[PDB]
Design an enzyme around this catalytic site. Structure first.
Site, PDB file in Angstrom:
ATOM      1  N   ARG A  78       0.786  -1.231   0.000  1.00 10.14           N
ATOM      2  CA  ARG A  78       0.000   0.000   0.000  1.00 10.14           C
ATOM      3  C   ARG A  78       0.821   1.285   0.000  1.00 10.14           C
ATOM      4  O   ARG A  78       0.300   2.350  -0.322  1.00 10.14           O
ATOM      5  CB  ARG A  78      -0.942   0.023   1.203  1.00 10.14           C
ATOM      6  CG  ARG A  78      -1.780  -1.224   1.353  1.00 10.14           C
ATOM      7  CD  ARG A  78      -2.792  -1.073   2.479  1.00 10.14           C
ATOM      8  NE  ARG A  78      -3.946  -0.276   2.072  1.00 10.14           N
ATOM      9  CZ  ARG A  78      -4.805  -0.630   1.118  1.00 10.14           C
ATOM     10  NH1 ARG A  78      -4.646  -1.778   0.460  1.00 10.14           N
ATOM     11  NH2 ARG A  78      -5.831   0.161   0.825  1.00 10.14           N
ATOM     12  N   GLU A 129      -0.215 -10.558  23.300  1.00 12.90           N
ATOM     13  CA  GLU A 129      -1.178 -10.194  22.263  1.00 12.90           C
ATOM     14  C   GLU A 129      -2.326 -11.190  22.195  1.00 12.90           C
ATOM     15  O   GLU A 129      -3.486 -10.799  22.054  1.00 12.90           O
ATOM     16  CB  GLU A 129      -0.525 -10.109  20.876  1.00 12.90           C
ATOM     17  CG  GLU A 129      -1.533  -9.663  19.816  1.00 12.90           C
ATOM     18  CD  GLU A 129      -1.094  -9.942  18.397  1.00 12.90           C
ATOM     19  OE1 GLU A 129      -0.703 -11.085  18.102  1.00 12.90           O
ATOM     20  OE2 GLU A 129      -1.160  -9.019  17.571  1.00 12.90           O
ATOM     21  N   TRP A 143       0.624  -2.742  18.883  1.00 18.89           N
ATOM     22  CA  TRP A 143      -0.644  -2.204  18.391  1.00 18.89           C
ATOM     23  C   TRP A 143      -0.871  -0.729  18.711  1.00 18.89           C
ATOM     24  O   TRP A 143      -1.861  -0.147  18.267  1.00 18.89           O
ATOM     25  CB  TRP A 143      -1.826  -2.991  18.955  1.00 18.89           C
ATOM     26  CG  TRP A 143      -2.071  -4.303  18.295  1.00 18.89           C
ATOM     27  CD1 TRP A 143      -1.535  -5.507  18.639  1.00 18.89           C
ATOM     28  CD2 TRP A 143      -2.944  -4.552  17.189  1.00 18.89           C
ATOM     29  NE1 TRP A 143      -2.025  -6.496  17.822  1.00 18.89           N
ATOM     30  CE2 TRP A 143      -2.893  -5.937  16.921  1.00 18.89           C
ATOM     31  CE3 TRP A 143      -3.769  -3.739  16.400  1.00 18.89           C
ATOM     32  CZ2 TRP A 143      -3.637  -6.532  15.895  1.00 18.89           C
ATOM     33  CZ3 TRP A 143      -4.511  -4.330  15.378  1.00 18.89           C
ATOM     34  CH2 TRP A 143      -4.439  -5.714  15.137  1.00 18.89           C
ATOM     35  N   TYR A 182      -9.488  -8.236  15.930  1.00 19.29           N
ATOM     36  CA  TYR A 182      -9.460  -9.635  16.367  1.00 19.29           C
ATOM     37  C   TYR A 182     -10.219 -10.035  17.625  1.00 19.29           C
ATOM     38  O   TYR A 182     -11.103 -10.884  17.566  1.00 19.29           O
ATOM     39  CB  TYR A 182      -8.015 -10.118  16.516  1.00 19.29           C
ATOM     40  CG  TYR A 182      -7.198 -10.029  15.251  1.00 19.29           C
ATOM     41  CD1 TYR A 182      -6.268  -9.009  15.077  1.00 19.29           C
ATOM     42  CD2 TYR A 182      -7.364 -10.959  14.223  1.00 19.29           C
ATOM     43  CE1 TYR A 182      -5.516  -8.911  13.916  1.00 19.29           C
ATOM     44  CE2 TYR A 182      -6.615 -10.869  13.050  1.00 19.29           C
ATOM     45  CZ  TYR A 182      -5.690  -9.843  12.908  1.00 19.29           C
ATOM     46  OH  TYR A 182      -4.910  -9.760  11.778  1.00 19.29           O
ATOM     47  N   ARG A 220     -16.101 -30.705  10.953  1.00 18.83           N
ATOM     48  CA  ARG A 220     -15.238 -30.115   9.944  1.00 18.83           C
ATOM     49  C   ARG A 220     -15.552 -28.636   9.739  1.00 18.83           C
ATOM     50  O   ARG A 220     -15.161 -28.041   8.733  1.00 18.83           O
ATOM     51  CB  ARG A 220     -15.372 -30.917   8.642  1.00 18.83           C
ATOM     52  CG  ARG A 220     -15.003 -32.378   8.885  1.00 18.83           C
ATOM     53  CD  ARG A 220     -14.926 -33.261   7.644  1.00 18.83           C
ATOM     54  NE  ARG A 220     -16.186 -33.391   6.927  1.00 18.83           N
ATOM     55  CZ  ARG A 220     -16.504 -34.445   6.183  1.00 18.83           C
ATOM     56  NH1 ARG A 220     -15.664 -35.460   6.073  1.00 18.83           N
ATOM     57  NH2 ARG A 220     -17.655 -34.478   5.528  1.00 18.83           N
ATOM     58  N   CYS A 254      -5.275  -9.636   9.340  1.00 16.84           N
ATOM     59  CA  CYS A 254      -4.285 -10.332   8.548  1.00 16.84           C
ATOM     60  C   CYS A 254      -4.556 -11.836   8.635  1.00 16.84           C
ATOM     61  O   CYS A 254      -4.560 -12.531   7.621  1.00 16.84           O
ATOM     62  CB  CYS A 254      -2.899 -10.024   9.076  1.00 16.84           C
ATOM     63  SG  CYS A 254      -1.679 -10.453   7.893  1.00 16.84           S
ATOM     64  N   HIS A 255      -4.739 -12.344   9.852  1.00 21.75           N
ATOM     65  CA  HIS A 255      -5.080 -13.749  10.004  1.00 21.75           C
ATOM     66  C   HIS A 255      -6.603 -13.723   9.896  1.00 21.75           C
ATOM     67  O   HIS A 255      -7.310 -13.474  10.877  1.00 21.75           O
ATOM     68  CB  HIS A 255      -4.628 -14.331  11.356  1.00 21.75           C
ATOM     69  CG  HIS A 255      -4.097 -13.328  12.333  1.00 21.75           C
ATOM     70  ND1 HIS A 255      -3.062 -12.467  12.036  1.00 21.75           N
ATOM     71  CD2 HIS A 255      -4.422 -13.091  13.629  1.00 21.75           C
ATOM     72  CE1 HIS A 255      -2.775 -11.743  13.104  1.00 21.75           C
ATOM     73  NE2 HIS A 255      -3.586 -12.103  14.084  1.00 21.75           N
ATOM     74  N   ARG A 283      -3.978 -13.897   4.916  1.00 28.02           N
ATOM     75  CA  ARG A 283      -4.084 -13.248   3.606  1.00 28.02           C
ATOM     76  C   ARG A 283      -2.805 -12.581   3.110  1.00 28.02           C
ATOM     77  O   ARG A 283      -2.570 -12.475   1.908  1.00 28.02           O
ATOM     78  CB  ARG A 283      -5.186 -12.190   3.639  1.00 28.02           C
ATOM     79  CG  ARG A 283      -4.852 -11.009   4.540  1.00 28.02           C
ATOM     80  CD  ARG A 283      -5.925  -9.922   4.508  1.00 28.02           C
ATOM     81  NE  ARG A 283      -5.552  -8.822   5.393  1.00 28.02           N
ATOM     82  CZ  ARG A 283      -4.608  -7.924   5.124  1.00 28.02           C
ATOM     83  NH1 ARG A 283      -3.939  -7.979   3.982  1.00 28.02           N
ATOM     84  NH2 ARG A 283      -4.304  -6.986   6.014  1.00 28.02           N
ATOM     85  N   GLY A 342       1.481 -11.985   4.423  1.00 31.45           N
ATOM     86  CA  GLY A 342       2.484 -12.281   5.418  1.00 31.45           C
ATOM     87  C   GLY A 342       3.879 -11.830   5.055  1.00 31.45           C
ATOM     88  O   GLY A 342       4.410 -12.179   3.998  1.00 31.45           O
ATOM     89  N   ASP A 343       4.459 -11.027   5.936  1.00 27.09           N
ATOM     90  CA  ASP A 343       5.822 -10.561   5.762  1.00 27.09           C
ATOM     91  C   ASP A 343       6.642 -11.729   6.308  1.00 27.09           C
ATOM     92  O   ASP A 343       6.649 -11.979   7.515  1.00 27.09           O
ATOM     93  CB  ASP A 343       6.070  -9.317   6.611  1.00 27.09           C
ATOM     94  CG  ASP A 343       7.467  -8.769   6.438  1.00 27.09           C
ATOM     95  OD1 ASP A 343       8.376  -9.552   6.095  1.00 27.09           O
ATOM     96  OD2 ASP A 343       7.662  -7.556   6.661  1.00 27.09           O
ATOM     97  N   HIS A 368       5.243 -12.563   1.256  1.00 24.97           N
ATOM     98  CA  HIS A 368       6.224 -11.654   0.704  1.00 24.97           C
ATOM     99  C   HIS A 368       7.418 -11.355   1.580  1.00 24.97           C
ATOM    100  O   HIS A 368       7.420 -11.596   2.790  1.00 24.97           O
ATOM    101  CB  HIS A 368       5.550 -10.335   0.329  1.00 24.97           C
ATOM    102  CG  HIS A 368       4.804  -9.697   1.461  1.00 24.97           C
ATOM    103  ND1 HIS A 368       3.476  -9.960   1.718  1.00 24.97           N
ATOM    104  CD2 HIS A 368       5.205  -8.820   2.413  1.00 24.97           C
ATOM    105  CE1 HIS A 368       3.090  -9.272   2.779  1.00 24.97           C
ATOM    106  NE2 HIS A 368       4.121  -8.575   3.219  1.00 24.97           N
TER     107      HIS A 368
END
Lengths: 280, 279
Positions: free
Chosen positions: B23, B60, B82, B108, B148, B168-169, B188, B190-191, B229
């Site tokens: 971004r 966290e 945060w 979250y 399931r 992110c998660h 979605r 991840g560094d 990434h």
């Protein structure tokens, strides 16, 4: 080879899967957490070692896009895959005695186009209600292809109990790079033998559709599975299918230039050169 | 489920990743769609090729569990990861002029414990409001292990605009078989160098917690990535890290029998034998 990856998963489940019963108590060989990458470049991932019900894949998706939650609207297209879950006996077993037959509740169609909206019934008008995830991913792809949040989620905890069935395809994420549109599906549960092939085709098809509307080239369809399983009764039949050398994947052809996702119709698609091995 | 899979992912991104900007126009090498399996059997996935901020992970998560959306509640624990997204200036930048500092919106914690509830503010009481996905997951594991649908989703399209950052998660799924609890996370973005090791530890820990609460043994933690990434200024450092000899994962000791997921406290956990390559 894309199909080889699929057959590879099957082999892995046979070799490493453990017994695990489903809701009905039926046994399956199961492995948790699997992933396959199906290239969508110049080919469509419709498995060849066993025929995939293409008309069902196509009609169901157009039905999702349409935002319908009425199984009768899909059934009338010659696809009855959702009829059972919308039948009287089934809806009553879930306690939806006052629900009209065919009303599957806030399933995919609703989630994709009206996420967050208050579901009434399948005939209700939801225009302008909820988040239209589908058009949003399309908009985002066009305006900000780098976006790492191009997600369409069907897993709505609040609506879950109202659905005739919890979605197997919790969510999918799109990705764009070098003019290629990729899609990853998080499938919480996959019947490798019967469902997964269909599942793969469905999302590869959605990707082809979006890529077409966004002027991008189909890239990769990443299939991620939670409970990847094989029903015990498909072990030997699958051992046979595993013997068949996969054939070239067919190709998907879109007969016209479609501008909006809602404008696609079954007639605009043509699966060319699909030659699956004989039924087992 | 070794750290070699994590390293392998880095190797693959360095090898096949293509340039893709985030971004901020900042470049990264990126691969879409990855997955690594991490065994939780008698070992904890706290990466050894580079130290992971365990305190941050632990606090966290406890913070997520209590359902807090107040960065100050985490900051008071010495974990400031945060704080920026809850700052006066950041909140105003997103148009949250009426928000008290630290109010991250329905992130979250809120999603996990009150999915679907109407977010008011971080001080609002949300008791019994929304779907308590975390408890439901625990309840389902105890009653129908074969289920399931044992999913906890943080991705709430509806609440996205109210959040300081989109989750992110996005979601995790649990799975039970042969008395082992496994967890798969769909991340979605991840560094690989910064967030991922932390993310892995977070869900590994969560799995350990729920496993402990449900009388199951931790099985595997499957980490699935969307946009995996590596930032450009991290390529060389990571290539060096790839040279580091992976060491045995440490062990996570839970020092007390906890009945409810909410009763876990930082002091109930102890990482044992963590010997990461110094930074």
């Amino acid at each position: 080879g894309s199909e080889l990856q699929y057959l590879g998963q099957i082999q892995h489940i046979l070799r490493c899967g453990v017994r695990k019963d489903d809701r009905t108590g039926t046994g399956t060989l199961s492995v948790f957490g699997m992933q396959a990458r199906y290239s969508l470049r110049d080919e469509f991932p419709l498995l060849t070692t066993k025929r995939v019900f293409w008309k069902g894949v196509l009609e169901e998706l157009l039905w999702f896009i349409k935002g319908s939650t009425n199984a009768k609207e899909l059934s009338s297209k010659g696809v009855k895959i959702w009829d059972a879950n919308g039948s009287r006996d089934f809806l009553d077993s879930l306690g939806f005695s006052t629900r009209e037959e065919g009303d599957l509740g806030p399933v995919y169609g609703f989630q994709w186009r009206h996420f967050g909206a208050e579901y009434r019934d399948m005939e209700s008008d939801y225009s302008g209600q909820g988040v239209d995830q589908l058009q949003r991913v399309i908009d985002t792809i066009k305006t900000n292809p780098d976006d790492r949040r191009i997600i369409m989620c069907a897993w709505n905890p609040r609506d879950l109990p109202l659905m005739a069935l919890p979605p197997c395809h919790a969510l999918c994420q799109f990705y764009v790079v070098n003019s290629e549109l990729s899609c990853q599906l998080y499938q919480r549960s996959g019947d490798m033998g019967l469902g997964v092939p269909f599942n793969i085709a469905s999302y590869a098809l959605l990707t082809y559709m979006i890529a077409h509307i966004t002027g991008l080239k189909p890239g990769d369809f990443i299939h991620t599975l939670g409970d990847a399983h094989i029903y015990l009764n498909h072990i030997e039949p699958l051992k046979i299918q595993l013997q068949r050398e996969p054939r070239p994947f067919p190709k998907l052809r879109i007969l016209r230039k479609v501008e909006k996702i809602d404008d696609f119709k079954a007639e605009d698609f043509q699966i060319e050169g699909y030659n699956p091995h004989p039924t087992i």
